Design a protein around this ligand. Structure first.
Ligand SMILES: C[C@@H](c1cc[n+]([C@@H]2O[C@H](COP(=O)(O)OP(=O)(O)OC[C@H]3O[C@@H](n4cnc5c(N)ncnc54)[C@H](OP(=O)(O)O)[C@@H]3O)[C@@H](O)[C@H]2O)cc1)N(C)C(=O)NCC(F)(F)F
Ligand SMILES: C[C@@H](c1cc[n+]([C@@H]2O[C@H](COP(=O)(O)OP(=O)(O)OC[C@H]3O[C@@H](n4cnc5c(N)ncnc54)[C@H](OP(=O)(O)O)[C@@H]3O)[C@@H](O)[C@H]2O)cc1)N(C)C(=O)NCC(F)(F)F
Lengths: 139, 140
């Protein structure tokens, strides 16, 4: 798949699904867990799916990184997914939806670099234009 | 004139409402949602007129979506106004249940308590294609 979509279930489920529909309509193959994570040990499958996708779309809904803070053992799944994307040098594309930019030091050192990528503001009023800009960011 | 009017709460149902719009348009329906089709003029007339003109009334019941309607007996809340118009016009009302808690009828103004008597569709994150197929079957 061209695109891996990483998101928080309790706050980004609808936006992540909306993004999947739009990207598939423009010709991109998309991984989101509820449609592409199939049989087996999900720990391995999820990481392999991040490693295989050229683009890493990160849904930054309100508080999306809160469960990453102080996750020193790296047991939080958004944390694991971001570290994998960073380690593999993927095209990281953050989607900003009411997200408050935290200070880097509140985040584990192995994912602080996520804050250095250019993010795209999600606009409820200009969704077609938001989508067209996301397509420009994808490789 | 649109086949479907989508009623929703900005602060909790914005993304689901937009997702329903995309899916319904892909299946050949003309859809009204405010951010794409409410244009110039006094919006109070234009909003009520757009409910009246659509055969189907799709209501996004996200968590707490009817809270601002409670004790709104002056009918100044917009979801309240849209529901009342839909009920009064005998529209095909199709509630979409997304984590919604069913309230006792007595907490709502009497002119909209009937919205709770319509058969609602449970939104499933895991089975979204199947949810959309059921919504289409409910549309006229
Ligand atoms: C573990 C879970 C998972 C978690 C995280 N991500 C990635 O990470 C981000 C979301 O992160 P997140 O923080 O929002 O999500 P959670 O960690 O909170 O887990 C959410 C719910 O999955 C329940 N749950 C626990 N164990 C299992 C299990 N063996 N099988 C099925 N469900 C399980 C858990 O049950 P609970 O803990 O007892 O409540 C909780 O209900 C995204 O980017 C994602 O790709 C991916 C998958 N998982 C395999 C599925 O969902 N599989 C079903 C699917 F349809 F998706 F394939
Ligand atoms: C009044 C508002 C509106 C309200 C309700 N609905 C229906 O009702 C449900 C949503 O209900 P809701 O409870 O979620 O929405 P709100 O009542 O909270 O208001 C929403 C935000 O529109 C701000 N706002 C206040 N005055 C104006 C104004 N003259 N022009 C533009 N924006 C204004 C207000 O600013 P604020 O009050 O000062 O913060 C508040 O932020 C849906 O089904 C909807 O069809 C439709 C429209 N409106 C005309 C627009 O948005 N027009 C832009 C658009 F792109 F949509 F055309």
């Amino acid at each position: 798949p061209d695109v891996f979509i990483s998101y928080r279930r309790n706050s980004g489920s609808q936006l992540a699904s909306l993004l999947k529909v739009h990207l598939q309509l423009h010709g991109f193959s998309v991984f989101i867990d509820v449609e592409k994570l199939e049989a087996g040990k999900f720990e391995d499958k999820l990481i392999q799916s991040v490693m295989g996708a050229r683009n890493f779309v990160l849904v930054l809904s309100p508080g999306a990184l809160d469960k990453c803070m102080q996750d020193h053992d790296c047991k939080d799944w958004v944390h694991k997914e971001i570290v994998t994307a960073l380690s593999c040098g993927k095209n990281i594309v953050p989607i900003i939806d009411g997200f408050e930019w935290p200070e880097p030091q509140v985040l584990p050192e192995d994912m602080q670099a996520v804050l250095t990528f250019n993010g795209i503001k999600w606009s409820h009023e200009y969704q077609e234009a938001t989508i067209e800009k996301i397509i420009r960011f994808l490789q």
